[PDB]
Design a protein around this motif. Structure first.
Motif, PDB file in Angstrom:
ATOM      1  N   UNK A 144      53.201 -25.856  55.258  1.00 39.61           N
ATOM      2  CA  UNK A 144      53.117 -26.554  56.552  1.00 39.61           C
ATOM      3  C   UNK A 144      51.687 -26.477  57.137  1.00 39.61           C
ATOM      4  N   UNK A 145      50.970 -25.462  56.724  1.00 41.65           N
ATOM      5  CA  UNK A 145      49.611 -25.241  57.155  1.00 41.65           C
ATOM      6  C   UNK A 145      48.555 -26.087  56.399  1.00 41.65           C
ATOM      7  N   UNK A 146      48.866 -26.613  55.202  1.00 43.46           N
ATOM      8  CA  UNK A 146      47.888 -27.419  54.460  1.00 43.46           C
ATOM      9  C   UNK A 146      48.295 -28.884  54.249  1.00 43.46           C
ATOM     10  N   UNK A 147      49.598 -29.107  54.093  1.00 43.72           N
ATOM     11  CA  UNK A 147      50.110 -30.430  53.779  1.00 43.72           C
ATOM     12  C   UNK A 147      50.135 -31.333  54.972  1.00 43.72           C
ATOM     13  N   UNK A 148      49.869 -32.613  54.758  1.00 45.96           N
ATOM     14  CA  UNK A 148      50.032 -33.577  55.825  1.00 45.96           C
ATOM     15  C   UNK A 148      51.482 -33.551  56.219  1.00 45.96           C
ATOM     16  N   UNK A 171      46.841 -32.714  50.708  1.00 43.33           N
ATOM     17  CA  UNK A 171      46.312 -31.438  51.253  1.00 43.33           C
ATOM     18  C   UNK A 171      46.861 -30.223  50.538  1.00 43.33           C
ATOM     19  N   UNK A 172      47.179 -30.441  49.276  1.00 48.54           N
ATOM     20  CA  UNK A 172      47.323 -29.394  48.294  1.00 48.54           C
ATOM     21  C   UNK A 172      46.037 -28.973  47.625  1.00 48.54           C
TER      22      UNK A 172
ATOM     23  N   UNK B 148      43.587 -33.659  60.115  1.00 49.37           N
ATOM     24  CA  UNK B 148      44.717 -33.355  59.264  1.00 49.37           C
ATOM     25  C   UNK B 148      44.791 -31.859  59.152  1.00 49.37           C
ATOM     26  N   UNK B 149      45.914 -31.349  58.669  1.00 47.91           N
ATOM     27  CA  UNK B 149      46.077 -29.906  58.503  1.00 47.91           C
ATOM     28  C   UNK B 149      45.030 -29.313  57.585  1.00 47.91           C
ATOM     29  N   UNK B 150      44.734 -29.969  56.471  1.00 54.53           N
ATOM     30  CA  UNK B 150      43.741 -29.382  55.523  1.00 54.53           C
ATOM     31  C   UNK B 150      42.315 -29.609  55.933  1.00 54.53           C
ATOM     32  N   UNK B 151      42.013 -30.751  56.528  1.00 49.21           N
ATOM     33  CA  UNK B 151      40.636 -30.939  57.043  1.00 49.21           C
ATOM     34  C   UNK B 151      40.337 -29.932  58.185  1.00 49.21           C
ATOM     35  N   UNK B 153      41.414 -26.866  58.544  1.00 47.56           N
ATOM     36  CA  UNK B 153      41.038 -25.567  57.962  1.00 47.56           C
ATOM     37  C   UNK B 153      39.573 -25.516  57.552  1.00 47.56           C
TER      38      UNK B 153
ATOM     39  N   UNK C 146      56.207 -37.489  60.898  1.00 50.65           N
ATOM     40  CA  UNK C 146      55.724 -38.165  59.687  1.00 50.65           C
ATOM     41  C   UNK C 146      54.245 -38.572  59.728  1.00 50.65           C
ATOM     42  N   UNK C 148      50.235 -38.651  60.473  1.00 51.68           N
ATOM     43  CA  UNK C 148      49.132 -37.716  60.535  1.00 51.68           C
ATOM     44  C   UNK C 148      48.803 -37.523  61.988  1.00 51.68           C
ATOM     45  N   UNK C 149      48.030 -36.492  62.295  1.00 53.27           N
ATOM     46  CA  UNK C 149      47.637 -36.230  63.679  1.00 53.27           C
ATOM     47  C   UNK C 149      46.888 -37.393  64.292  1.00 53.27           C
TER      48      UNK C 149
END
Lengths: 236, 236, 236
Positions: A144-148, A171-172, B148-151, B153, C146, C148-149
């Motif tokens: 949940x912290x990395x994936x869209x 975002x893996x 996004x969650x990964x960007x 970070x 669903x 993205x931010x």
């Protein structure tokens, strides 16, 4: 000895290579923890973690989950997620060199890196639902912290398989490379991250992941119980 | 006078151009606030904010942070984030014309726009960790709301630099344009947004950002204290 | 009869085709609920939901909102969001075949699918702000789950229109297809999802959406009141 540690100036490299699929059993977990202890002692500017030429890791040892003997299965899960936690809060930048597939605990471990390098061909997948398991809460918080938001839905309830550009967009991973460059590139990126301010990096890291670490420490503590809910809830 | 205000039918344009890097010092902050007051008074259908031909803004004045005199550094931070808050809750659509790089407070200000236009070449970056600072909580909430969650970070703990398509995919910008079209295009988009229903837009806006505004008002109020934790925590 | 139900081995297909725009009025809602009851009874491995050759659905019946008679407008909204909830928590994989545009309640319904297939040309849009309405909280929670931010910000306060690749990148759809393949492909994907473990899928599904279902059940329960706040708040 399934794990090598190697210092290389301002960084260290940790390579997993059991005989096969870098299964994350008690023995592998211990070695990795020992290898990180070395890095602690050596006070490295950055850490790189790699698999072998076939996988990053297939995840937990399947049969220690099959064999019906619960306590050691719980200790393995617990230990796997503690290890994830340890890397996710590590005070130095951590760079994952994903050198093959990364499945279940393998993907979750991967997702604990600051920067994650892989090749187009390598599958990254929470396969739990495809093989009959529900994903434990600690892995959910990691993902949940990395994936869209939309990739997260499919990675979980659908066990979607992610490769290359679709993994990056999901975002893996953070970066794609050719297979023979993955490690090399992880190392170069590690050296550049060692150039960042260590204390600011360590502080910012923890702020950027505050809630997720809290919820992961709750998933570690609840893993035994979580397994018991399942047991009972089937029994009904 | 570092800031121009210009009415143009249903919209207004606010352009920052100090001599150099549109540094967000007390003087710049005041001018911008005054320019927004004009827009309030003129009851415009949409607002456009632009930098100059070299930058959107390099962010806070570096030396007012260096000089050791705390109170005015706090007032500047506080003021920068209030200004961000003011634009993030603005009842009219706000369109950011990103006309060069946008660094630290510059990026945070950028991320308070409804729609954000830039060129491929322009760097958008929270450079705090690269220069030895932890990101304050108010900037984290701003970023956490667009990235996004990964960007998110990597923008934070790694001070990742984002350009063009990688900025768009990351959710630092909404639209790419050629440099000489950025402003022109921001203005056209502003006029189309003025055509939306103002009250529904204003209400929906606030609902879409409810928690983040709460957490940002908490980051403004805690900025002085946040600076004190740091001071003490080094001293240990 | 605006809705067909059709069993096809391990799956079922539900097709909406009123005369026109698959408007989600009381009559359409009932039929769909009945069609899902069939699927319940038939214990299908997967569900597919499709529109007709012009739309997925234009959303709620506009005039039942215009006509000033509140109670039936509330019952329609309430019913629309209950239906959304019912599909979002469904114990079988649900595959949406988006066969034309999907506007407002149509988009929200779409976003309740496990996997969502559409064509490049089909618009997916919360048009509320463009026609003078604020988005109710239940639709916000659906979208927030669903999108993205950054797409979420624009879909809402700006009523951004999303098509094809920009819808996929935004997390309004999971897959693009040619128009004449959309249904066919939804069905193939449904059969593959039926091959996943049903109980693990059902459990994981609910874990992956826990908070959002809670907040949606709150948006259903608060829809009447939400409408009253609006009424009063205009009156001021």
């Amino acid at each position: 000895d399934p794990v090598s540690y190697t210092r290389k100036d301002s960084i260290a490299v940790i390579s997993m290579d059991d005989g096969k699929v870098n299964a994350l059993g008690p023995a592998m977990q211990q070695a990795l923890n020992a290898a990180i202890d070395n890095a602690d002692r050596d006070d490295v500017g950055a850490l790189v973690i790699t698999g072998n030429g076939r996988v990053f890791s297939g995840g937990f040892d399947l049969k220690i989950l099959t064999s019906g003997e619960v306590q050691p299965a719980i200790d393995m899960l617990r230990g796997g997620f503690e290890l994830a936690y340890r890397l996710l809060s590590y005070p130095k930048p951590v760079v994952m060199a994903c050198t093959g597939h990364a499945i279940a605990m393998g993907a979750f471990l991967l997702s604990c890196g600051d920067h994650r390098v892989a090749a187009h061909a390598y599958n990254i997948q929470a396969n739990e639902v495809a093989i009959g398991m529900t994903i434990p809460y600690a892995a959910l918080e990691i993902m949940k912290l990395r994936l869209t938001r939309s990739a997260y839905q499919q990675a979980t309830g659908l066990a979607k398989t992610f490769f290359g550009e679709t993994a990056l967009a999901a975002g893996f991973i953070d970066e794609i490379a050719l297979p023979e460059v993955v490690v090399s590139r992880a190392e170069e990126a590690a050296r550049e991250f060692a150039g960042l301010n260590q204390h600011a990096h360590a502080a910012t890291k923890l702020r950027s992941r505050a809630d997720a670490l809290t919820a992961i420490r709750a998933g570690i503590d609840g893993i035994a119980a979580e397994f018991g809910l399942a047991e009972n809830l089937y029994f009904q």
